[PDB]
Ligand SMILES: *[C@@H]1O[C@H](CO)[C@@H](O[C@@H]2O[C@H](CO)[C@@H](O[C@@H]3O[C@H](CO)[C@@H](O)[C@H](O[C@H]4O[C@H](CO)[C@@H](O)[C@H](O)[C@@H]4O)[C@@H]3O)[C@H](O)[C@H]2NC(C)=O)[C@H](O)[C@H]1NC(C)=O
Ligand SMILES: *[C@@H]1O[C@H](CO)[C@@H](O[C@@H]2O[C@H](CO)[C@@H](O[C@@H]3O[C@H](CO)[C@@H](O)[C@H](O[C@H]4O[C@H](CO)[C@@H](O)[C@H](O)[C@@H]4O)[C@@H]3O)[C@H](O)[C@H]2NC(C)=O)[C@H](O)[C@H]1NC(C)=O
Ligand SMILES: *[C@@H]1O[C@H](CO)[C@@H](O[C@@H]2O[C@H](CO)[C@@H](O[C@@H]3O[C@H](CO[C@H]4O[C@H](CO)[C@@H](O)[C@H](O)[C@@H]4O)[C@@H](O)[C@H](O)[C@@H]3O)[C@H](O)[C@H]2NC(C)=O)[C@H](O)[C@H]1NC(C)=O
Ligand SMILES: *[C@@H]1O[C@H](CO)[C@@H](O[C@@H]2O[C@H](CO)[C@@H](O[C@@H]3O[C@H](CO)[C@@H](O)[C@H](O)[C@@H]3O)[C@H](O)[C@H]2NC(C)=O)[C@H](O)[C@H]1NC(C)=O
Ligand SMILES: *[C@@H]1O[C@H](CO)[C@@H](O[C@@H]2O[C@H](CO)[C@@H](O[C@@H]3O[C@H](CO)[C@@H](O)[C@H](O)[C@@H]3O)[C@H](O)[C@H]2NC(C)=O)[C@H](O)[C@H]1NC(C)=O
Ligand SMILES: *[C@@H]1O[C@H](CO)[C@@H](O)[C@H](O)[C@H]1NC(C)=O
Ligand SMILES: *[C@@H]1O[C@H](CO)[C@@H](O)[C@H](O)[C@H]1NC(C)=O
């Protein structure tokens with residue numbers, strides 16, 4: 155006292171990878187030496203009498219304490235400064251949501267903002283839409299501390315399905331006159347779902363014939379989102395493409411199928427739905443049969459009175475036949491009737507009863523032909 159050594163400015167705040175000027179001086183009349191201790195890269199530089207100046211550029215260092223030294227009178231004169239690099243949130247990220255999140259299942263939300271500083275100036279917010287869920291001021295984290303993460307565990311709500319969630323970070327440079335700088339991570343929309351036991355209730359008649367169209371329905375309730383769930387219904391390889399009704403959490407699929415001409419109904423009826431990563435499938439055994447329509451013929455179909463006529467009917471040998479009350483004799487093949495034409499037999503029609511049993515189910519076909 156005297157002398158002294160001064161560095162200007164003593165405190166400095168700059169952009170990361172940014173630059174500034176430093177003027178370090180002393181009152182020493184004939185400095186025997188002078189210079190600056192720092193690790194930072196220098197672009198330009200200046201100097202003069204009793205004062206030396208440096209432009210330091212590309213500063214990625216969160217905290218650096220450079221020191222200007224002047225050697226005078228075989229003695230060292232040191233002045234230490236402080237350099238801090240602030241960070242704008244050019245990078246704000248948020249973790250992938252569950253592709254489907256079961257409603258009622260706790261899931262977690264993490265917001266990672268790599269390279270954020272100073273940590274003590276940061277207030278982070280995890281929020282659903284306009285409403286803040288969790289807010290964290292990091293003030294009091296060490297001056298050298300950089301980076302910020304916020305995790306919040308959350309219960310899944312049904313009314314919160316389809317909303318937009320985000321992580322908003324707020325940096326306060328207001329004390330330094332630089333002011334607030336805030337940013338928002340890419341908003342993520344959540345997909346949720348719900349299910350239930352009691353596999354789908356499918357209703358169908360168990361008997362089927364080709365060339366005939368019969369309706370079949372499959373339903374279930376307590377399913378959300380109803381609209382976002384897709385359902386499949388088919389007979390064997392053949393798809394029914396049913397009419398799908400959706401009311402609230404319940405659905406209705408109605409169609410009218412047609413038998414496929416092949417074997418079965420040892421085939422099956424498959425009703426399944428896929429929502430989220432889950433599926434509930436119920437199956438139904440059934441029966442498709444082939445029952446050839448019985449043919450009724452007469453020769454001559456129109457005859458004079460008294461002329462002998464013949465009449466026959468056949469089920470294809472696999473079914474039993476009743477011809478005008480007369481059973482097939484013998485059963486394995488068609489029966490017959492013959493007579494002399496009668497005046498009272500004009501406009502007389504005859505019945506042919508074909509009976510085929512499958513799974514105990516008795517099937518009949520009434521077919522008649524009038525005589526002229
Ligand atoms: C869904 O997520 C939530 C959020 O993490 C969470 O629910 C919690 O489940 C746990 C275990 O089921 C419970 O947590 C605690 O349970 C004890 C009883 O053993 C309570 O006494 C606790 O109350 C105090 O908790 C703090 C102490 O750690 C106190 O500081 C505070 O003042 C409370 O008085 C606490 O509830 C509980 O069932 C809930 N907790 C809450 C508050 O919701 C869990 O991860 C998921 N819930 C499920 C799966 O049911
Ligand atoms: C309803 O839910 C059911 C869940 O089981 C689901 O079943 C699937 O049906 C399809 C046909 O519709 C299956 O078909 C596959 O077809 C291809 C040929 O194109 C095969 O390569 C597949 O191979 C499997 O089976 C082979 C033997 O045939 C094996 O060698 C092989 O290793 C495989 O196991 C298979 O035959 C399909 O496998 C099933 N299952 C699944 C998990 O998809 C049905 O699709 C659902 N309906 C809808 C629209 O959601
Ligand atoms: C250190 O890195 C520097 C970059 O950070 C490089 O800068 C060299 O020098 C100048 C200044 O940076 C560059 O720009 C030139 O600017 C003048 C105009 O000068 C303006 O400012 C003066 C006050 O100084 C003012 O009086 C004038 O009215 C202007 O408004 C232009 O006319 C030039 O064409 C030029 O663009 C140079 O480009 C750059 N040098 C080279 C070779 O590119 C430099 O590499 C390092 N050194 C210094 C001293 O900065
Ligand atoms: C950093 O070094 C000092 C800051 O302390 C600055 O020195 C300045 O130099 C000018 C030169 O014209 C001074 O102007 C005159 O100096 C004479 C003495 O040489 C004096 O008699 C005059 O009255 C007048 O002041 C100026 O005073 C001086 N500034 C200060 C604050 O002392 C220099 O400009 C700075 N350089 C850089 C690159 O920052
Ligand atoms: C949260 O933000 C999203 C947008 O980021 C809002 O939902 C969006 O609604 C629009 C308009 O219906 C959807 O647009 C399109 O729908 C057609 C179907 O007609 C589809 O083909 C397009 O590909 C597109 O999806 C859009 O899907 C939907 N956005 C998302 C992310 O699903 C929503 O309204 C906002 N929620 C709140 C609470 O404000
Ligand atoms: C906000 O985030 C976007 C996307 O990462 C980024 O490009 C942008 O620089 C940020 N804006 C501000 C001013 O923080
Ligand atoms: C459906 O098919 C299976 C063959 O795996 C059979 O065991 C079962 O008895 C059938 N169901 C009915 C109701 O007949």
Ligand SMILES: *[C@@H]1O[C@H](CO)[C@@H](O)[C@H](O)[C@H]1NC(C)=O
Pocket residue numbers: 462493494
């Ligand atoms: C019907 O035809 C048969 C066959 O020739 C004949 O024997 C019989 O007399 C005929 N019956 C009558 C009542 O015409």
Ligand SMILES: *[C@@H]1O[C@H](CO)[C@@H](O)[C@H](O)[C@H]1NC(C)=O
Pocket residue numbers: 518519520
């Ligand atoms: C004859 O036709 C009627 C009307 O379609 C039907 O209800 C009945 O089952 C048939 N008779 C027999 C024995 O198949």
